[PDB]
């Protein structure tokens, strides 16, 4: 338990003192390991004004295996399930304890201004996105407004 506390405390110090811009995180209530999380959508993206929610989970060996990070907001994105899951290499095999929440957050949003459909999460959006790019980005505009307010 306890290296997993004392980083994981440091952590959230960092988020109170000194955060990424656009977000904001913090404990559910008296469980340190179990977190909620913010991002604004990156301007000049179709996410652009929503406020995405996330479920952040950390392991109890944190920081030596990722947390696990999901969306609780809807969105419409080749990398994104309609589960939340997220496919993110640093949420995975490419975890690093170098690597904070505050640095994933920003690899999240880093995620949405890059929708990438060659090896989708989600087949069905990718589709869409690689057939019409314009297409994808009007559906993932709508998304943001009908399921993505602050
Ligand atoms: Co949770």
Same mark, same amino acid.
């Given at each position: 338990?306890?290296?997993?506390?004392?980083?994981?405390?440091?952590?959230?110090?960092?988020?109170?003192?000194?955060? !990424?811009?656009?977000?904001?995180?913090? !404990?559910?209530?008296? /469980?340190?390991?179990?977190?909620?999380?913010?991002?604004?959508?990156?301007?000049?993206? !179709?996410?652009?004004?929503?406020?995405?929610?996330?479920?952040?989970?950390?392991?109890?060996?944190?920081?030596?295996?990722?947390?696990?990070?999901?969306?609780?907001?809807?969105?419409?994105?080749?990398?994104?399930?309609?589960?939340?899951?997220?496919?993110? /290499?640093?949420?995975?095999?490419?975890?690093?304890?170098?690597?904070?929440?505050?640095?994933?957050?920003?690899?999240?949003?880093?995620?949405?201004? /890059?929708?990438?459909?060659?090896?989708?999460?989600?087949?069905?959006?990718?589709?869409?996105?690689?057939?019409?790019?314009?297409?994808?980005? /009007?559906?993932?505009?709508?998304?943001?407004?009908?399921?993505?307010?602050?």
């Amino acid at each position: 338990a306890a290296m997993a506390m004392r980083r994981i405390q440091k952590e959230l110090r960092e988020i109170q003192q000194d955060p !990424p811009c656009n977000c904001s995180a913090g !404990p559910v209530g008296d /469980d340190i390991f179990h977190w909620t999380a913010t991002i604004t959508g990156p301007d000049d993206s !179709p996410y652009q004004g929503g406020l995405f929610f996330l479920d952040v989970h950390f392991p109890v060996d944190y920081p030596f295996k990722a947390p696990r990070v999901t969306f609780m907001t809807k969105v419409y994105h080749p990398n994104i399930n309609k589960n939340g899951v997220i496919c993110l /290499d640093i949420l995975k095999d490419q975890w690093s304890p170098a690597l904070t929440l505050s640095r994933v957050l920003l690899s999240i949003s880093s995620l949405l201004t /890059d929708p990438n459909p060659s090896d989708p999460l989600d087949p069905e959006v990718a589709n869409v996105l690689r057939a019409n790019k314009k297409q994808f980005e /009007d559906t993932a505009r709508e998304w943001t407004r009908m399921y993505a307010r602050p």
